[PDB]
Amino acid sequence: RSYGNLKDQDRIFTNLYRDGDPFVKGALKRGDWHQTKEILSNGPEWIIDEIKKSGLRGRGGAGFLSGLKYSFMPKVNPDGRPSYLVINSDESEPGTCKDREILRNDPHKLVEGALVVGFSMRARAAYIYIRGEFWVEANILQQAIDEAYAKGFIGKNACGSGYDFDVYIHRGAGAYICGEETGLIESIEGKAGQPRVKPPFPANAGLYGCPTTVTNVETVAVCPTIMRRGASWFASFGRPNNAGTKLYCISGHVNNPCTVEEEMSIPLRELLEKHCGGVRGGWDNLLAVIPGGSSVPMMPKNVCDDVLMDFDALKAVGSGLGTAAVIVMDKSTDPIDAILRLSKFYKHESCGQCTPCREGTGWIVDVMERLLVGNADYAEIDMLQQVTQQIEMHTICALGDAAAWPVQGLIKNFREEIEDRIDSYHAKHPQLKKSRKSNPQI
Amino acid sequence: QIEIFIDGKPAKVDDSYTIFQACYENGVIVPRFCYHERLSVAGNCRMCLVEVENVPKPVAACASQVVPGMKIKTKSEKTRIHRGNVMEFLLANHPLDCPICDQGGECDLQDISSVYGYGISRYNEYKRAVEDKNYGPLVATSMNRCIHCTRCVRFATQIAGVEDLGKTGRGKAAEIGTYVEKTFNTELSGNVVDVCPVGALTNAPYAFTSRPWELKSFYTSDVFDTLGSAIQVDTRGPEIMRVLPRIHEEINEEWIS
Amino acid sequence: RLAAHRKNDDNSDSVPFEFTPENYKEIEKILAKYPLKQKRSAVMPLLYLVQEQNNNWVPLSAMKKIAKLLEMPEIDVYEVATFYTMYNREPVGKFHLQICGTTPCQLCGSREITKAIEEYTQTKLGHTSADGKWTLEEVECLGACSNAPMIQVNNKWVYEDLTTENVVKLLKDLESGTDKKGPQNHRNQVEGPLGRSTLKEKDFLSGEIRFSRDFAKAKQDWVAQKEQERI
Amino acid sequence: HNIRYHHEIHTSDQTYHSSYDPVGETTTERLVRYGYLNKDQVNNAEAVAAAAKEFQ
Amino acid sequence: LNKENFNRQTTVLPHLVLSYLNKNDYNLKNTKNDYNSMEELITHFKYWSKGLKVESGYTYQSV
Amino acid sequence: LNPYSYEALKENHWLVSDSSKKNSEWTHKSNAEQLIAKVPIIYVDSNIVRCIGGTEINAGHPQVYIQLDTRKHGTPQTCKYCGLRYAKKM
Ligand SMILES: Cc1cc2nc3c(=O)[nH]c(=O)nc-3n(C[C@H](O)[C@H](O)[C@H](O)COP(=O)(O)O)c2cc1C
Ligand code: SF4
Ligand code: SF4
Ligand code: SF4
Ligand code: FES
Ligand code: FES
Ligand SMILES: [Zn+2]
């Protein structure tokens, strides 16, 4: 079938455009906190099975199966230590602006999902890690949590089911690396926030040495609606192994940048000229698209003309869905400049703990700065490819891979453009002697 | 008690071992910079990366437990490539300081580069520069040479019991040391020099005077305190040049005052 | 920023610091948010409190006071305050402008609005003005890519959809204090210009929305089917 | 900018060793010396066959 | 005949074979020394302080 | 100021100083300290300076990089091969 053209009834986030009050009154008017007592009455194993059968996958940029991952949590703690559920509300991936909309429009959905998931994994408390740049969103979520306490939905007799659940907000400062799960836990535990060496995994030893799980806002927020609607309803949308709806944020050189919600595995072009008003100057004016966050490698128009928007489809063409962030570029865009700015972003956000990332981010930026102006060699492109392959897959965490991928995509798609720039520079700038000293500082 | 394989030779170890411990006990030498036999396990450097089948990514030998039936290939070409890449990244920002560095002739960076690295460089940009700090008349600092190995921080926290050292900053511009101008005043302070693999921290009294190859060593015991610390005396001709600790495990462990 | 303590006459050990009683109540609430043995976890919130009550920057004496309060070494407070770029360890101007420069905002004209702010405030991209009213700084993505280009003020308020003249008008409004939050144009939060394209239905979006299920029968079916397949 | 193969991968360091038993040694002497037979059970077909199979 | 090239002076080029075959090694040796490369400076220091390391074995070579 | 005092030692890398610089013609057998002290401070615009001790590579000393962004603004720094001293301009 032709995926897309979702009905308004099947939207989960009906408050995304601020058509009602986001607080407890509007949340009850929209159906939040409805029949939650009946949900908590069933055993946690039933909730785990329902999430597994729903086919929901992580929306944080990985795509792991949420139900199985939640099932990884231990069933009992002989030590008496508690279990913690952590909501990854940190969002610093360039191009992605969806969880901000969720928090500032539908906070009670997040709270209800947190309660349901924590009950499913038998967790005592829930810590929501919001970035410091989301000041307004943090205030709104805190007010919603206060209302939830005042209405007796969480804490002490949470929904009158005998379970104790506290929801807390931990506001973190500016750091992209704090989005990584172990780095997030280290940031909560009064530390810098550097990622840990795994194994061990947070399912065994996480926050404070207790079992912990880290999950995105979107999955938690859609869990209660999935539970009420049913697993089959969620699985009825999208391709197999790509079930459910998805929030797409589109920005850049498109006519109508916006955030929408649509059935997963939707065609890319059909999405753009259905919701975002088409590419500026027409489809022929398109140069490249980044299907996910800045971590995902960029795509050329050749595959953008036909590719669908999901995990497997974007992975089969040398990309990934990531966080469903769509960046569109016109023919007036300089790909080298955009990728250089992305590399400069990744250079500033490295935590500096482990060697390959800490040196390779700076080396990549320094090489790309010369590649932009043409003051380079034809072999420097291959050297950069080799340097990226050395950085990736050798580091403590997955940020090194995220820094390596965009440069590899840029090389693979516009080696000819890079060569043309270098050729023009060397044709306009004759030079015979080669300096034995280092390159001038930029 | 599990059976593993190191370069094709079967071996029997305990299930609690790390790959590095098994390799060392079986006579296999793995390069390292941040791992120390008495401090906590850190995995910040990556020079101990090895190659294991059915595991796509290289695995850090020091910070990974052994698995029954696994095979470690320390002599494959993939391990050579891993070590070369890590050495390249380590030497990208290292200063050209060997003639003026007191670590020359006994630097682990030099020997590891010579034995395992590619042997030549291609980095042609400005390196980072770090201003030196003052820690007192016993420890001399040249912080351009630091590789952020955390050995000094772990030694100060876990062995000396003082909490004055740390890592402030982020990324490539992060710096190791005290935030404010403060001396590293403590007993067992000079020991931190022996912990640091590079010439970042050096013996300030033993500054520029000698080189490792022109010294003769003797084993003896100390009398300055009633613990008979096992010590090594390094001399050049009729002049005693320095004193180093030894290993006893019943006296002074590894350390001297 | 330098990853060390710069020698400053107004930021020495002799500089006094003390939490306000309202900040002390906030401190006890924050410590109640965390386990008894994990008081150090409250280092990040308390820092904000300092930055709230001391003109948007954190002095060294405040960090020492936090270390004493949380029974943790001063070096850990130093590491936390230096790791995160959102904490100011030096005094900053009255209006701290943080212009986004990441590629999604760069494609929409971040450089042009940066040049406009530069030419209005008479202050460079990474600099504080002579009078101390403005501090221009470039930052990474601020999570508002759809409403690009956008800036943030004082780590508090975000302003989106800026042009060459709209950013000048916004700066004048900020000077006069009569500014408008959110987008500087007709755009209504995240929905794109030229109207919206989804959530068009209003009868369903203005009435009571309910979805009921029989969880008792669901559980009985689940237990019956798992028992049957196990048999 | 290519540095990965500045060092030789294949080198001429191979050594080959050959070890032989004494030419004048008989089968019985070889079986006795290698701990597959004893001097007493010499000149017996069953002992010789068992030692030969054990050796093989 | 060339006017400004070095080959005008004489027909002997003692680096033509070496540059023809081992171009990669010729390029590296002519660009990096112990004054602008860390690896090369480490090699120089080890070479002139302790010497090169030779794997254990026996050889006999005659000329 | 007493060269054996706490302040003088602390601001001299914990070494006994010599303002006259004339002890080194006997202890170090040359007058190089005086000559290098005769060279004024070079003021650099950027935060980092590169020293090679000459006009070309191999005529001087290996490339070294000196930080001029100090804890105290404008503190001069000395090359560890050649005695030249640099400071950030204003
Ligand atoms: C460098 C880095 C940054 C990340 N940033 C985020 C982030 O901002 N938000 C998020 O939800 N996950 C982020 N992740 C992914 C998390 O580590 C983790 O995989 C995810 O939160 C799992 O949740 P999910 O199953 O709901 O996707 C990041 C991962 C890495 C390596
Ligand atoms: S890969 Fe980079 S961000 Fe991740 S642990 Fe290493 S230094 Fe930190
Ligand atoms: S620490 Fe010193 S001897 Fe060791 S390689 Fe580095 S500069 Fe050379
Ligand atoms: S100063 Fe030396 S020992 Fe200390 S962390 Fe740095 S490299 Fe390691
Ligand atoms: S020695 Fe293993 S990571 Fe450092
Ligand atoms: S790139 Fe500017 S808000 Fe994301
Ligand atoms: Zn010099």
Side-chain angles (χ1 to χ4, degrees), chain A, chain B, chain C residues 2-231, chain D, chain E, chain F:
Chain A
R1 78 206 185 87
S2 66
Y3 311 97
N5 194 24
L6 192 46
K7 297 309 286 286
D8 286 321
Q9 290 95 18
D10 302 337
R11 271 71 173 175
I12 310 191
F13 301 99
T14 62
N15 211 36
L16 194 86
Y17 288 163
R18 196 54 81 90
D19 292 326
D21 197 90
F23 297 122
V24 65
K25 301 281 303 300
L28 295 190
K29 192 169 166 47
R30 287 188 297 275
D32 297 318
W33 292 115
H34 183 247
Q35 274 185 266
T36 317
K37 169 63 181 295
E38 283 82 358
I39 302 166
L40 297 184
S41 59
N42 291 345
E45 291 101 4
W46 184 78
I47 298 160
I48 280 293
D49 283 358
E50 202 70 20
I51 299 297
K52 284 200 185 200
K53 291 174 47 90
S54 178
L56 171 66
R57 293 167 81 166
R59 309 302 207 244
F64 199 86
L65 274 297
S66 307
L68 182 72
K69 161 174 169 142
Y70 295 162
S71 73
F72 289 163
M73 279 291 259
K75 299 291 180 68
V76 68
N77 263 307
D79 210 346
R81 55 186 80 180
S83 308
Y84 305 115
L85 162 67
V86 171
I87 292 161
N88 196 343
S89 183
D90 175 272
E91 172 154 340
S92 315
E93 182 65 26
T96 311
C97 62
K98 45 166 184 81
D99 297 344
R100 167 206 199 201
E101 311 316 314
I102 290 158
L103 262 72
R104 88 165 150 190
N105 284 331
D106 285 298
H108 281 291
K109 281 215 194 294
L110 175 68
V111 186
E112 185 188 37
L115 167 65
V116 162
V117 171
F119 179 79
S120 174
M121 59 193 42
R122 307 162 171 97
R124 204 210 71 75
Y127 282 95
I128 316 188
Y129 194 93
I130 301 104
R131 66 188 294 197
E133 283 86 353
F134 290 162
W135 187 60
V136 186
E137 285 69 23
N139 295 115
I140 295 165
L141 184 63
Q142 180 66 63
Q143 171 159 343
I145 290 163
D146 274 304
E147 272 160 1
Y149 288 165
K151 296 280 295 285
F153 288 138
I154 43 167
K156 308 280 193 175
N157 214 13
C159 274
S161 68
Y163 197 75
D164 292 331
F165 209 58
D166 297 1
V167 181
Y168 294 127
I169 278 180
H170 184 92
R171 196 187 161 213
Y176 171 60
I177 191 52
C178 278
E180 190 276 331
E181 40 185 26
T182 54
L184 196 155
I185 281 150
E186 291 280 271
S187 187
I188 295 171
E189 305 175 348
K191 283 179 269 277
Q194 291 177 151
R196 297 156 168 194
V197 159
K198 39 179 81 170
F201 304 109
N204 176 220
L207 178 73
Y208 304 142
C210 295
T212 317
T213 183
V214 183
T215 184
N216 199 229
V217 165
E218 206 178 332
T219 72
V220 165
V222 302
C223 284
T225 300
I226 282 159
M227 295 299 291
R228 264 199 294 281
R229 290 299 272 283
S232 59
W233 168 86
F234 207 63
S236 63
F237 305 115
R239 264 178 62 227
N241 296 114
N242 301 260
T245 62
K246 188 88 198 214
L247 278 155
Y248 296 100
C249 50
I250 304 98
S251 66
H253 281 156
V254 73
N255 276 327
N256 184 37
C258 74
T259 285
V260 289
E261 175 197 338
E262 208 79 9
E263 178 196 342
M264 189 153 147
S265 286
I266 173 174
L268 178 64
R269 182 181 191 170
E270 190 276 331
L271 177 136
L272 276 296
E273 292 82 3
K274 173 169 198 146
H275 293 291
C276 305
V279 187
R280 232 167 65 195
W283 189 249
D284 47 324
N285 212 5
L286 189 143
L287 169 82
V289 180
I290 306 178
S294 282
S295 307
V296 166
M298 64 180 288
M299 294 183 286
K301 192 185 172 297
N302 290 318
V303 298
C304 283
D305 287 327
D306 283 275
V307 72
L308 312 185
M309 283 298 280
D310 59 83
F311 290 129
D312 314 319
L314 289 169
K315 194 179 50 182
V317 304
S319 289
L321 184 50
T323 56
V326 194
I327 316 291
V328 187
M329 293 180 183
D330 283 6
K331 297 276 191 31
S332 81
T333 304
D334 196 340
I336 315 185
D337 192 14
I339 300 300
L340 165 69
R341 188 61 186 87
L342 280 196
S343 316
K344 286 192 200 178
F345 160 84
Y346 276 106
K347 173 182 146 194
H348 169 246
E349 302 302 326
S350 168
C351 71
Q353 190 190 356
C354 79
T355 316
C357 174
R358 176 178 71 232
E359 275 85 5
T361 48
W363 199 1
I364 285 186
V365 170
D366 269 23
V367 170
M368 284 282 300
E369 285 262 36
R370 272 183 300 116
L371 276 194
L372 172 68
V373 302
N375 185 40
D377 278 18
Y378 270 22
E380 302 197 10
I381 299 138
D382 298 305
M383 182 179 72
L384 190 41
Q385 179 65 255
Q386 216 184 28
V387 162
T388 55
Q389 273 163 316
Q390 293 175 180
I391 296 163
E392 81 179 3
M393 204 189 148
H394 285 70
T395 43
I396 276 172
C397 85
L399 189 149
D401 310 335
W405 291 333
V407 185
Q408 290 172 3
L410 166 77
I411 287 170
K412 177 176 143 188
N413 286 306
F414 301 98
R415 187 187 257 281
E416 208 173 15
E417 270 69 25
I418 301 156
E419 282 155 357
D420 295 2
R421 188 85 55 81
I422 294 183
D423 266 330
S424 82
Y425 178 80
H426 277 307
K428 293 182 183 293
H429 274 96
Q431 169 74 253
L432 215 57
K433 184 180 177 181
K434 185 184 151 296
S435 83
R436 287 310 183 234
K437 302 182 271 214
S438 76
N439 277 102
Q441 190 81 301
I442 276 172
Chain B
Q1 191 84 249
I2 55 165
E3 183 178 1
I4 67 152
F5 302 93
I6 300 155
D7 284 318
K9 275 78 71 176
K12 298 261 160 194
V13 286
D14 188 67
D15 66 275
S16 62
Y17 278 35
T18 66
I19 289 147
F20 186 92
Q21 287 185 293
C23 282
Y24 181 87
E25 184 159 354
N26 283 144
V28 178
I29 301 303
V30 185
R32 69 185 154 130
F33 285 116
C34 80
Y35 172 69
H36 194 287
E37 279 94 356
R38 261 172 215 282
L39 319 173
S40 59
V41 169
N44 63 7
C45 82
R46 328 282 302 160
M47 185 63 72
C48 80
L49 285 176
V50 296
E51 197 259 329
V52 174
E53 293 82 3
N54 312 326
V55 178
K57 322 181 44 167
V59 62
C62 80
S64 306
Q65 314 301 130
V66 292
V67 167
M70 65 180 288
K71 306 181 294 292
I72 299 100
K73 307 281 161 266
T74 43
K75 273 144 170 296
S76 60
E77 178 79 1
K78 290 195 61 55
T79 308
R80 191 192 77 96
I81 284 164
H82 298 331
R83 290 175 178 164
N85 301 348
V86 180
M87 192 64 264
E88 208 188 1
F89 284 138
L90 267 171
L91 285 192
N93 280 274
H94 208 68
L96 300 176
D97 268 19
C98 297
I100 61 171
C101 184
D102 278 349
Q103 207 61 222
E106 46 182 21
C107 188
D108 263 346
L109 203 66
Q110 268 182 337
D111 275 22
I112 283 182
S113 172
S114 294
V115 175
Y116 303 91
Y118 288 140
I120 200 157
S121 88
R122 43 176 178 190
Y123 179 92
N124 200 21
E125 271 90 9
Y126 274 46
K127 316 173 171 253
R128 67 184 184 273
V130 188
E131 197 201 350
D132 300 13
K133 276 82 72 175
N134 176 43
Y135 288 172
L138 281 188
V139 179
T141 56
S142 194
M143 304 294 332
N144 273 344
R145 291 156 207 170
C146 174
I147 62 179
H148 305 59
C149 83
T150 317
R151 263 175 173 220
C152 52
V153 181
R154 289 179 278 143
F155 172 79
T157 292
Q158 310 165 357
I159 308 295
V162 292
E163 270 68 51
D164 61 278
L165 285 177
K167 190 267 291 181
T168 74
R170 206 163 75 201
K172 209 190 81 162
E175 281 170 32
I176 293 287
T178 75
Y179 187 66
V180 298
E181 271 290 286
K182 164 154 98 149
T183 47
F184 191 40
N185 69 77
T186 174
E187 295 80 69
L188 324 173
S189 72
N191 282 310
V192 73
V193 174
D194 307 315
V195 189
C196 174
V198 293
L201 309 170
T202 53
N203 189 359
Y206 181 72
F208 317 137
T209 56
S210 176
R211 279 286 181 198
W213 56 78
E214 56 184 43
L215 300 173
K216 194 171 185 179
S217 302
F218 310 90
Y219 277 16
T220 180
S221 301
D222 184 48
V223 300
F224 273 121
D225 78 320
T226 56
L227 293 201
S229 278
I231 52 153
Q232 172 192 311
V233 174
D234 287 0
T235 79
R236 189 215 181 172
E239 310 185 358
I240 294 159
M241 295 299 291
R242 73 174 159 181
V243 173
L244 287 173
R246 291 207 278 118
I247 289 179
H248 203 298
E249 288 272 23
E250 319 208 331
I251 308 160
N252 66 7
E253 284 152 305
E254 275 182 29
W255 304 104
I256 57 179
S257 85
Chain C
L2 200 74
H5 172 254
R6 282 207 208 269
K7 299 289 95 175
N8 199 359
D9 268 24
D10 304 344
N11 194 8
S12 48
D13 291 331
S14 299
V15 168
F17 190 87
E18 175 76 81
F19 281 112
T20 72
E22 298 90 4
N23 273 328
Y24 272 118
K25 306 302 294 306
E26 199 39 60
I27 281 171
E28 62 89 19
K29 292 213 195 305
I30 293 162
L31 288 172
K33 273 181 188 176
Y34 290 105
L36 274 296
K37 293 218 201 90
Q38 316 279 13
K39 272 202 300 186
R40 63 168 310 136
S41 289
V43 59
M44 291 182 86
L46 263 69
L47 275 151
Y48 280 128
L49 284 188
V50 164
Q51 189 173 0
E52 273 271 289
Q53 72 167 89
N54 195 357
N55 299 296
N56 207 39
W57 71 289
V58 182
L60 175 77
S61 286
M63 308 165 27
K64 293 180 185 291
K65 182 82 184 268
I66 288 169
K68 191 184 290 292
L69 205 49
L70 291 184
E71 311 172 354
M72 65 197 269
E74 271 147 26
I75 192 58
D76 315 329
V77 187
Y78 297 153
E79 297 168 26
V80 168
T82 307
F83 186 87
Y84 300 99
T85 47
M86 199 150 180
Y87 293 133
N88 307 117
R89 300 184 307 280
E90 294 293 328
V92 74
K94 171 170 200 333
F95 292 106
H96 188 68
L97 314 177
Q98 308 156 0
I99 305 100
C100 194
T102 308
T103 297
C105 275
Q106 189 189 193
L107 299 157
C108 308
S110 74
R111 262 90 64 80
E112 281 77 8
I113 79 163
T114 301
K115 289 191 214 295
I117 302 172
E118 213 162 8
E119 85 187 348
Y120 174 80
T121 50
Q122 299 318 304
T123 303
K124 291 321 181 77
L125 187 153
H127 275 103
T128 315
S129 80
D131 76 320
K133 180 177 291 282
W134 311 103
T135 306
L136 277 79
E137 166 153 29
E138 183 162 340
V139 291
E140 307 268 34
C141 172
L142 299 179
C145 304
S146 285
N147 313 61
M150 61 79 71
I151 64 151
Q152 200 177 21
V153 176
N154 284 335
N155 291 306
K156 301 283 198 294
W157 285 115
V158 285
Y159 307 92
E160 294 100 6
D161 302 303
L162 313 167
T163 67
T164 61
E165 70 273 13
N166 285 98
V167 76
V168 160
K169 162 177 179 192
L170 171 69
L171 280 181
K172 299 187 62 50
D173 278 335
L174 270 183
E175 195 149 15
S176 48
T178 81
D179 46 312
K180 166 167 93 171
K181 273 76 192 151
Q184 294 313 278
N185 48 354
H186 67 279
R187 196 169 179 183
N188 189 359
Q189 278 184 352
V190 65
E191 68 180 0
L194 321 168
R196 63 178 74 176
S197 74
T198 180
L199 279 299
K200 295 293 176 65
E201 214 191 332
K202 300 294 187 291
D203 286 284
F204 175 84
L205 273 68
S206 287
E208 296 286 326
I209 297 169
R210 294 299 182 281
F211 296 104
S212 307
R213 197 178 144 179
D214 200 77
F215 301 87
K217 182 174 72 68
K219 172 59 134 44
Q220 82 171 117
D221 291 331
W222 170 79
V223 61
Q225 67 175 348
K226 62 150 181 53
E227 186 183 351
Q228 168 190 340
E229 61 86 20
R230 182 195 56 88
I231 279 170
Chain D
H1 310 110
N2 193 31
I3 65 149
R4 193 169 274 190
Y5 298 97
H6 188 32
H7 289 190
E8 323 202 6
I9 295 314
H10 325 275
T11 47
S12 311
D13 292 288
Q14 289 85 335
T15 313
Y16 307 93
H17 171 61
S18 277
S19 180
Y20 300 84
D21 270 320
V23 169
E25 178 164 72
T26 80
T27 290
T28 295
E29 310 180 1
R30 201 163 285 134
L31 287 173
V32 171
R33 196 189 76 210
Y34 269 93
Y36 296 86
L37 209 47
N38 51 2
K39 59 188 100 172
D40 291 331
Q41 295 297 109
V42 69
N43 293 359
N44 188 287
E46 305 317 290
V48 173
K53 184 44 99 184
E54 283 190 4
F55 202 102
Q56 188 96 46
Chain E
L1 272 186
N2 290 318
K3 289 302 280 292
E4 297 87 18
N5 203 320
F6 187 83
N7 49 43
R8 175 57 177 284
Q9 321 300 312
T10 175
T11 76
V12 182
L13 310 160
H15 287 148
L16 62 85
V17 179
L18 177 79
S19 178
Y20 208 105
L21 304 159
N22 299 117
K23 182 47 93 163
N24 172 233
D25 309 316
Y26 193 69
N27 283 342
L28 281 158
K29 184 257 167 182
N30 270 269
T31 42
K32 292 301 185 178
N33 46 16
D34 61 290
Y35 289 66
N36 67 342
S37 169
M38 180 85 236
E39 274 90 331
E40 182 65 26
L41 182 71
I42 289 181
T43 298
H44 171 105
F45 195 101
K46 291 314 284 307
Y47 184 87
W48 282 114
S49 85
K50 205 66 170 291
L52 74 163
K53 178 184 58 166
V54 181
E55 191 271 331
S56 76
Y58 165 76
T59 194
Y60 169 77
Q61 294 291 113
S62 57
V63 159
Chain F
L1 191 63
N2 202 317
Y4 283 88
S5 61
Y6 171 77
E7 309 287 329
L9 287 156
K10 189 174 192 192
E11 303 312 315
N12 203 45
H13 293 232
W14 307 102
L15 311 169
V16 182
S17 68
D18 186 31
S19 309
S20 82
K21 293 174 179 294
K22 290 184 184 293
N23 280 3
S24 64
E25 301 71 11
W26 161 256
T27 50
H28 285 72
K29 272 82 190 161
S30 83
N31 69 325
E33 217 176 330
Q34 300 176 358
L35 296 196
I36 197 55
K38 287 180 212 308
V39 190
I41 306 173
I42 297 93
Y43 289 105
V44 194
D45 188 54
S46 67
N47 277 335
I48 187 174
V49 68
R50 177 188 65 194
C51 198
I52 65 184
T55 57
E56 294 293 328
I57 292 300
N58 209 354
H61 64 71
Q63 299 184 184
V64 290
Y65 298 84
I66 305 160
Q67 183 63 255
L68 314 177
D69 198 3
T70 50
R71 283 82 58 85
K72 321 181 164 173
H73 284 294
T75 304
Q77 314 271 303
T78 300
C79 176
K80 286 155 175 224
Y81 285 95
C82 73
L84 288 188
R85 308 170 284 147
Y86 304 86
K88 181 195 174 57
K89 194 187 283 294
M90 182 179 72

